[PDB]
Subunit: 102 residues, 2 copies
């Protein structure tokens, strides 16, 4: 009559949202947590893609290459609002167009 002690294993998956500030300074983009992770300082030359989500108006992503790095870092964000999303993506798309013209 041995009953065995066992654990059922259940995959959980969820999406955490961590507050940042995103600042655009000329061709630099600074992605800054308030006060533990480090601030990210990107140059427009590093951005390979920047896109407002088609499903969720408030979502956008910025993909980034760096010089000694194999992979693309893929940074997904949610803006405070659909309108702030479109502003941030447009401003970055225009900086990237301008930079790439050269």
């Amino acid at each position: 009559y041995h009953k065995y002690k066992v654990w059922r294993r259940q995959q959980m998956s969820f999406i955490n949202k961590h507050e940042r500030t995103l600042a655009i300074d000329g061709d630099y983009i600074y992605i800054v947590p308030p006060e533990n992770v480090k601030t990210k300082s990107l140059h427009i030359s590093q951005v390979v893609l920047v896109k407002k989500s088609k499903r969720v108006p408030e979502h956008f992503k910025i993909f980034v290459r760096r010089e000694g790095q194999d992979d693309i870092k893929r940074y997904y964000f949610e803006a405070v609002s659909g309108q702030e999303c479109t502003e941030i993506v447009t401003r970055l798309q225009n900086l990237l167009s301008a930079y790439r013209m050269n």
Copy 2:
């Protein structure tokens, strides 16, 4: 300066304690509410090749319903093997005897 939220997908395994008991052709998994299986409902029971304490049991309620997949962790690789063996023996005697 815009206020934005970095979205980060996080994934992990939640482990829920149960007891597993076998009585004749029935399997009881209890901590939720008690779950009872007949051996005819079991499609497959397999020990992990990577993690010796892990096993899984696949189940079909009725007829040709979609298979449901349950994953479990035992106290030890020995006890995982013992559970897997006992349930395989039962399923085999059911299919053949």
